[PDB]
Structures are given as C-alpha cells and as structure tokens.
Design a protein around this ligand. Sequence first.
Ligand SMILES: CCOc1ccccc1N1CCNCC1
Length: 185
Amino acid sequence: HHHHHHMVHITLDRNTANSWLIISKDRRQVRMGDTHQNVSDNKERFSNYPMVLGAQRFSSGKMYWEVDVTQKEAWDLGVCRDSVQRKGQFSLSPENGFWTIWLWQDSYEAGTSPQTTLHIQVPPCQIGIFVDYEAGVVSFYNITDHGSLIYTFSECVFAGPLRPFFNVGFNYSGGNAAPLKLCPL
Ligand SMILES: CCOc1ccccc1N1CCNCC1
C-alpha cells in the first residue's frame, strides 16, 4: 500500500477508558492494570471490556495509523462510531457501529456478524489501519509482512463521526499484560 502519507497522530482519550486501564503520560500506550485504577465513573467509560477510544474524531478524508501488538495473546483494533454503546455486553459488528479485527486463541478474525476467518502467514507485531471516509472503506495491513493486506471492510455505513478503537484484552492467562502502543510516524 501507499497509505503512509495520510498518517495521523492518534492519542488516547482517558475519559473513555475502562477503569482498569493505564494510559501512558504521552497518551500513546495503554495496558490492563491488575486492579481498578482509582478513577471516578462516567457515562463515556466502557464498563464490560478493557476498551478505550482515540481522542480524534473523523467525518471526512483519508486517515492512517499504526499499532504495536508485540507479545499479546488477545486484542481488538479498528474504528467505531462516536455513538457506540459503552455499558454492558455487546458484539463487535458493523451493525453495532464497529469496524475491527482481533486476535483470540491463536487465530485472527474480522468483526463481521458472524465473524470472518483471516489468513495471515506472518503473525503481525504492528498493524496499519486505513480509513477512507468518503469511499466507505476500513482496511488493515500487516506491517511485519511488508504491509500485506489483512482485511477490507467496504460499503461501510459509518453513519456519523468515527473514533480510533482499542481493546487490550483481559489477562486471565498471565500472558497478555503487554501494552498496545501507537507507533511513531
Ligand atoms: C477482571 C475483573 O473484571 C473486569 C475488569 C475490567 C472490566 C470488566 C471486568 N469484568 C466485567 C464483568 N464480567 C467479568 C469481567
């Protein structure tokens, strides 16, 4: 791909974070803490999952960013509507306002309903996310494998402003403590 030139500087929005998340001072890294992080509750926080949004809102244009997933066992990445449900249980689907891929139990899947199997020969350590608002496209790239395509959602119905979306995953195993990191441009 030649999408790198639409690079945007993403930072994480503390106010949207699940109360167990720890966001770095520079707002570029997030990990699961071992306990509640001593913040007050608010209507923006994701309550059932270790999720957080980017601060940036997009309603037009082409945008690209990269995320480091090194040594993680489980995570979700992509974009979502600003108006997604924050409280209780829900599935990641375009019908619910999410355009995502994930790693879970040694397999990669796209968050369609039902989910779609991904075919990745080189497990990625960094993922590139490309959004073309006008075209209705969200694409995922394997930076570890020379930028090879992972998945494209097309004919997307964004239906409002979009925010970068992250899930660091639980750490029931003791093997998923590593952070998600936004990579430099
Ligand atoms: C591990 C302690 O639990 C959480 C920690 C952070 C977010 C959600 C949960 N729950 C929500 C209720 N179901 C169990 C996990």
